Amino acid sequence: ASVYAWNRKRISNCVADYSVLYNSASFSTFKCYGVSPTKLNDLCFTNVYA
Amino acid sequence: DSFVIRGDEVRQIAPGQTGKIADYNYKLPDDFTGCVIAWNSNNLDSKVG
Amino acid sequence: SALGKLQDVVNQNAQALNTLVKQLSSNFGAISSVLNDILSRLDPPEAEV
Numbered sequence: 001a002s003v004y005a006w007n008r009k010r011i012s013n014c015v016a017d018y019s020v021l022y023n024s025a026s027f028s029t030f031k032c033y034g035v036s037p038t039k040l041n042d043l044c045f046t047n048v049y050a
Numbered sequence: 051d052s053f054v055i056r057g058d059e060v061r062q063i064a065p066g067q068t069g070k071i072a073d074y075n076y077k078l079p080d081d082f083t084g085c086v087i088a089w090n091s092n093n094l095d096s097k098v099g
Numbered sequence: 100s101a102l103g104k105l106q107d108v109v110n111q112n113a114q115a116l117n118t119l120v121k122q123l124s125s126n127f128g129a130i131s132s133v134l135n136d137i138l139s140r141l142d143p144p145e146a147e148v
Contacts, residue, residue: 025070028058030068030069
């Protein structure tokens with residue numbers, strides 16, 4: 001989607017294997033604020049928003 | 051410590067950085083005391099094909 | 100009330116303790132008032148700050 005009409009996808013009731021993202025080489029920018037992605041494998045949340 | 055990388059990866063040669071290079075190839079300490087120097091070598095390390 | 104001069108003392112100290120404990124729940128500019136939560140979210144280079 002265009003930036004002005006940016007899409008939002010809600011993620012809930014699922015297991016998040018963040019490795020697939022932080023082990024991939026397909027990304028040029030991967031910047032996590034207030035968190036480290038590796039630790040996200042040990043963390044739970046009520047919702048995520050992509 | 052001398053080596054060669056690609057351009058956009060030069061940013062990874064610094065303390066506290068992450069990525070393929072900083073993780074699996076060459077990792078600097080968070081308390082690094084020293085200099086990092088880098089210059090393009092397309093004329094030397096690149097060839098047709 | 101006759102024993103106020105004693106009770107007051109106790110109360111004072113109690114406050115000075117409660118306040119102290121309360122000051123653990125603050126952030127002081129940090130992203131969290133807890134320590135393990137920071138250790139479980141950040142790497143040393145920023146958890147240190």
